[PDB]
Design a protein around this nucleic acid. Structure first.
Length: 337
DNA sequence: TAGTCACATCAGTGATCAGTGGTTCCGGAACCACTGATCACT
């Protein structure tokens, strides 16, 4: 995690309680205080104090807010004070979301339905990449953060970097693009997708807004270039760049194998459980749904309900905390709630 | 008794297009000139 210094551009002049408060909070955190409280009255500007504390500590910060409403107004403001560091975002990426719900009394299956937002997931993946690519990363998170996730381990593993001049098989590059959830959209150009024409390859990464054109000298990386996605305007050129998986359900083929194994084992477990319960209808419905799900893992590796198998994918045990953006954070990560 | 909770998609469902199957339709009297009798003569 390469942590660039949190360059603070604050034309405001701190006064009143700001200096003493920041100093005492700083020494508080220095004192190993795993539990701290702040009394910030209205108009006291908690955002600036949090930014300065993050600057002093130089740790990847996770800030916790209770509703997506709040996150918006603050994160943009901090970017003004931090125009040279990774400022990020994460909340529920759902314009709408009915859960997988079950009216037991009526035996009614209100199936999980969701109108999926785009920019929310974009910023989610940008945040995960930034955390697993640099230490100067600040992320605003809804409680969703503590829900089940994939492993930042595999997140950083599946990611692959390419540099100008280095020999690299283009076909292997496409293979790893597929393995990191990027589609060979040879028809049009879309987010997290890409197209191949001759040695030329043009890709929009899922987290990175812009696109990139790579020219190939046979099976060698001829050159890399930033781009506007559709117009293709080369923003600039850099020798090397990394790509992270477009999914947070990152998992090597071996991790998919282990997840499938544990899924089948706990599937037998739940089969016996519902058989004893006498809930044969529910048992069979779950059985066939997960049968289709595992079929299209063994074929594709992608579907709905993948999260429900996080304990298998992450591989940790039942009842333990599933993977989290906290794992995406270091142990010396800054935390604010 | 109650506000937030958030981890996509088989399968209709037909619109709608957008390809395929087929449509369909006029002017005919002119124009080019060609062709079997009829007195004629023998």
């Amino acid at each position: 995690r390469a942590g660039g210094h949190f360059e603070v551009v604050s034309p405001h002049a701190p006064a009143g309680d700001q200096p003493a408060a920041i100093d005492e909070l700083e020494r508080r955190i220095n004192a190993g205080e795993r539990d701290v409280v702040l009394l910030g009255a209205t108009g006291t500007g908690k955002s600036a104090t949090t930014a300065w504390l993050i600057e002093r500590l130089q740790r990847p910060t996770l800030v916790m807010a209770p509703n997506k409403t709040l996150a918006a107004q603050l994160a943009n403001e901090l970017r003004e004070m931090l125009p040279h560091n990774a400022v990020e975002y994460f909340v529920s990426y759902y314009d709408y979301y009915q859960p997988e719900a079950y009216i037991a009394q009526t035996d009614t299956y209100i199936e999980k339905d969701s109108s999926i937002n785009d920019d929310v997931e974009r910023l989610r993946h940008s945040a995960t990449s930034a955390l697993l690519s640099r230490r100067d990363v600040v992320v605003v998170a809804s409680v969703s953060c503590i829900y089940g996730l994939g492993t930042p381990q595999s997140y950083l593993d599946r990611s692959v970097e390419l540099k100008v001049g280095e020999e690299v098989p283009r076909d292997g590059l496409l293979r790893l693009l597929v393995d990191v959830q990027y589609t060979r959209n040879d028809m049009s150009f879309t987010r997290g997708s890409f197209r191949v024409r001759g040695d030329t390859v043009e890709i929009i990464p899922s987290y990175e807004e812009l696109a990139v054109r790579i020219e190939f000298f046979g099976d060698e990386i001829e050159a890399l270039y930033y781009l506007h996605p559709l117009t293709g305007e080369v923003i600039r050129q850099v020798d090397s760049l990394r790509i992270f998986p477009a999914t947070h359900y990152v998992a090597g083929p071996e991790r998919m194998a282990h997840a499938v194994s544990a899924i089948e084992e706990e599937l037998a477990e739940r089969l016996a459980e519902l058989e004893s319960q006498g809930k044969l209808l529910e048992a069979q419905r779950l059985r066939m749904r997960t049968n289709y799900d595992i079929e299209m893992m063994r074929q594709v590796g992608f579907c709905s309900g993948i999260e429900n198998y996080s304990r298998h994918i992450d591989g940790r045990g039942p009842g333990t905390p599933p993977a989290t953006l906290l794992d995406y954070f270091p142990e010396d990560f800054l935390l604010v709630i």
